[PDB]
Structure formats: structure tokens, C-alpha cells
Symmetry: C2
Subunit: 283 residues, 2 copies
């Protein structure tokens, strides 16, 4: 935050827009961030999250958590290894569990254990994609909701709170990618949770939402994705004989031979910078 | 920056995209000292300009101690300048982490005829030894291209006024980190900034261009100087207020390009360039003023 003279007009003006300002009148520590990686492609997923978390002057000490091979043995800790530690941040990734009932998810008990533990041990937890479905069940009792057809593509969103911290810097309307069977109706989520809805798709899905105490935050797309991530899912779904739809608004001229761009990069960077600055660190 | 195990694949993979990564075996902390940032405000609307730049500089966990520098005594919100601005002589003997030199209404004014030209040259000569990184905005780019590189004033035949398409040139550059390949930024300038010509005369890195080949962003490899030729600090309404002022002055201006909904000046403009103004100033503070 800036430090300016007490009477500078900016003090009251920026405070009115929810900007913290220090004045001439009136500590630094490494942050501990745990990542619970449930994604099938562990290394790609590590690279995507750690790129966004490295874009900060804050020292972010990363611990990788497995729910429960050489790569995992070398770089990941188990829950028991860290159950006595406190963290400034926890990221729970997505997982390919859109079509799986909670009671058929092999490690459902271990996920419940981590989320119940986060209540006392983690300042701010961020839930991504399927982890939102999981957290809405375990924290708020909301049943699994499933769409008829997969949402796969780069969608138009709008912000709801001009002065909100988590959407600080965001354009009034912006792109973010989705790849999910999970359904996330915003009006229903608001009713059942009283969480603040910070961004929505044009069709009324919740994209971003969080608690006013900043302990929990939810993102239902994949703004951490590389340009090519949805292309790889597509070609995989083709070769598996699922006969998928081309992801929406993704390939130049909707031709899968053309090179996709990361048209959603900007608001992924803003999201993670905002999460670290205002939720994990807390100005 | 992150700290990860030494052999984690992300270490070599992120270093290859120009991302600084620390490891178990080799790491250092965030530097604890507050940053010192000086703003040379040459804009006519002193308070609106303070609010716009201070909004972007406050969006950071880094403590940024701000000093406001006036270039002249000449009278103007006279009392505001007396209460809140220092003179050059007040900060002559100090070092700063950053200096912003704002734009100014001097696009149609020869350098000869700029009352405070000697004070501008004085500050830019002083910045070489006293400021880690200096950012030049809008007309200040024209001033700095003349004073640092001997490039004469280039002037467009018509004012560039509006919200334009740009592209980045360097996917892994620090100053454009997080930027989309294509993005919006506003311009309000008579000054001409052909990118190919500026690259020839300066050897600066061109980091973003407009679609008509103007330089938008460029910087020195040593990080001592950076240049932005538009106004990403502008509020939603700033271009509208310029337009209404110009019509009132009987200049009968064109509507700013791609700005008013339906191109109708009775409609409420949005800040469609907010995102990349935030990324720019966050990147300037993190990688140029602070230096990860």
C-alpha cells in the first residue's frame, strides 16, 4: 500500500473505493502455501499454479500435498506430515470427478479430513473447479449438481462488485475457461451459502465467490490453464471415441488444427495476485 | 517468488519462461525496506492525476512512500501544491526506487516554447544517478526521447483519442507479464511514436505496439527507464471529460474511438482497459522499482 500525507485527497477518495492507504501520521514474513493436487497431470498442474504464485514480491514457501509414484514420493508430503502445521494458504485443485458420486470417490474421507482441518489451520483456502463441488457439499451440505452436457470453452464473465478485493483490476467483463460437468447456479449458491458472488458467466453460473472473512474462496473455471490445455482434453476425448464438441470460442475459426491462444491469461494473473495479496497475506 | 524443492520440474520449466524461482538449497527473503516513489505531476488536473496513479501503486503488498514533485512556482490549485508538493532542490540529494513523469498538454508545443523545459532536463539528468527505474507517460515519452536520445518532436496530423487494440511482442517479458497477446489501452496524444523508428534510434526493447505500429510500451534492458505512450491510469470518464472540454472550446473533435457505448456521447463509458493498466503498474513496481 502507498504511504502519503494525512490530508491528501487520495486518502479519503481511495478509501471510498475500498483501497487501503497508509498516512505519514499512523512486518515481512515468508507465506506458507499448501497445494492439494488432485489433477491427473501432476507436473502440468504444478507448473500452471506455481507460475501464477511466483508473480509476486512475497516469498511463497510451497508444500505439495498428496491425498494418497516416484514424483509424489520425492516432492509430496502426506496429511499426517503437516497436520500439526499452520498455513497462510491452501489450494485444492480440480479432479476428473464431474460424473462420480461423492460416495464413489475413493479418497472422499481424506478430502473431508483436509477441509475440516483447514478451518483451524489455514488463513485462506482457494477451491478450484470440482473442489468447489466438494467444498459446497462438506462445508454447506449442498448436493452434487451435474449439467446435461459438459461446459468446455472460453466464456464471457462480468464482475458484480466494482470495489471487491478478489476482482481488483478486473475489467467489467472478461474471459475465463471452463471444463466441467459440475453445475454452479449463482442465485442458488448465494441462497444456500450467503457467500459473496464476485463474478458470473453470462448464463448465470458463479465463477468467483468468497466469504467476507476471506477464509474461503471459490473459482469454478481454470484460469491457470496454458493455451493448449483444452486442446489436449479435446484430442484425448476424440481418441477415446467420446466424439466431443469443439471447445467454445477457443480454436481460431473453430478449427482444431489452428493454434489456440491463452485469451484468459490477464484475469488469471489478476485473480492469483489478488488472492495472495488480500486473502493469503492480507493488507 | 515461490520457494520449491531443488529438483521439482517447475524450477527449470519456469526459469525457461523467465520466471524467478527459489529452492530449498538457495533462497532469500522479501527485502523489508519501504520503496521510495517520486511523481513529477505535469498534468493540468493535479488531484485526478494523483488519484489515478496512487490507485495503481496502492495495489501491492509493498509499502510505497510517495513524494509529489512540482516542476515550477508559476501559478493552478496553488494551496494544494504548497501543502503536498516538494521542489526539485528539496529532493536533489535523495535516492528513489521509482520516478513517474506524467503526461502534459504539450503535444502541439515546440520544446523551445515549454516554459519549464530546463527544469524537465534537470530532473531527467538527475534521475540517471538518483532513481532505480523511471517511467515516462504520454508526452513525457516525447520529452525523454529528445533529452536522452536526441530524437526530435514527431507530431501526428490528427490527435489519437480513444481505446485501441495492442499486441505484446515478447511472451516472457517482465513488464508485460500476465498480459493477453491482444489487449486494450487508451491514447490521448498528438505525439507520434513509430515503433521501428524508436527501436533504430534507442536500442530499447519494444514490448507492445498498437495495430498501426506505434510503440505503446518499451524499456531499457537495465530496467533504468520504461515508457508508456497511452493512459492506462485513466478512469472510465477521463476521455469523456476531454471530449466535452474540446467541443466547448469549439475544436469540434471526433468522438474518442471505441469508447462510448454505441459511439453515443450521452452513454456511460466503461474502463475497458483497466486490467492491463493494473498488470503494467504491478509489473513496474515488482520487476523495475523493487526488482525480483
Amino acid at each position: 500500500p502507498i504511504r502519503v500525507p494525512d490530508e491528501l485527497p487520495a486518502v479519503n477518495f481511495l478509501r471510498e473505493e475500498n483501497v487501503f492507504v497508509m498516512t505519514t501520521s499512523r512486518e515481512i514474513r515468508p507465506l506458507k502455501v499448501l497445494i492439494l493436487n488432485l489433477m491427473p497431470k501432476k507436473i502440468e498442474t504444478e507448473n500452471q499454479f506455481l507460475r501464477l504464485l511466483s508473480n509476486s514480491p512475497l516469498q511463497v514457501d510451497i508444500q505439495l500435498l498428496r491425498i494418497d509414484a516416484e514424483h509424489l514420493n520425492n516432492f509430496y508430503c502426506n496429511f499426517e506430515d503437516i497436520q500439526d502445521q499452520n498455513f497462510d494458504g491452501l489450494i485444492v485443485t480440480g479432479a476428473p470427478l464431474g460424473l462420480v458420486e461423492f460416495n464413489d470417490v475413493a479418497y472422499w474421507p481424506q478430502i473431508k479430513q483436509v477441509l475440516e482441518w483447514s478451518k483451524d489451520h489455514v488463513t485462506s483456502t482457494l477451491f478450484v473447479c470440482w473442489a468447489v463441488q466438494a467444498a459446497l457439499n462438506i462445508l454447506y451440505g449442498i448436493p452434487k449438481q451435474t449439467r446435461t452436457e459438459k461446459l468446455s470453452g472460453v466464456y464471457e464473465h462480468h464482475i458484480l462488485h466494482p470495489h471487491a478485493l478478489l476482482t481488483r483490476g478486473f475489467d467489467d467483463s472478461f474471459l475465463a475457461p471452463h471444463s466441467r460437468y459440475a453445475d454452479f447456479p449463482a442465485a442458488l449458491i448465494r441462497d444456500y451459502t450467503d457467500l459473496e458472488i464476485l463474478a458470473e458467466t453470462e448464463e448465470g453460473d458463479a465463477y468467483l465467490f468468497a466469504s467476507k472473512d476471506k477464509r474461503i474462496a471459490f473459482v469454478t473455471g481454470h484460469p491457470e490453464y496454458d493455451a493448449q490445455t483444452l486442446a489436449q482434453e479435446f484430442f484425448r476425448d476424440v481418441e477415446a471415441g467420446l466424439d466431443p464438441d469443439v471447445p467454445y470460442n477457443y480454436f481460431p475459426h473453430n478449427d482444431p488444427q489452428n493454434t489456440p491462444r491463452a485469451s484468459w491469461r490477464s484475469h488469471g494473473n489478476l485473480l492469483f495476485t489478488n488472492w495472495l495479496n488480500y486473502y493469503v497475506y492480507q493488507i
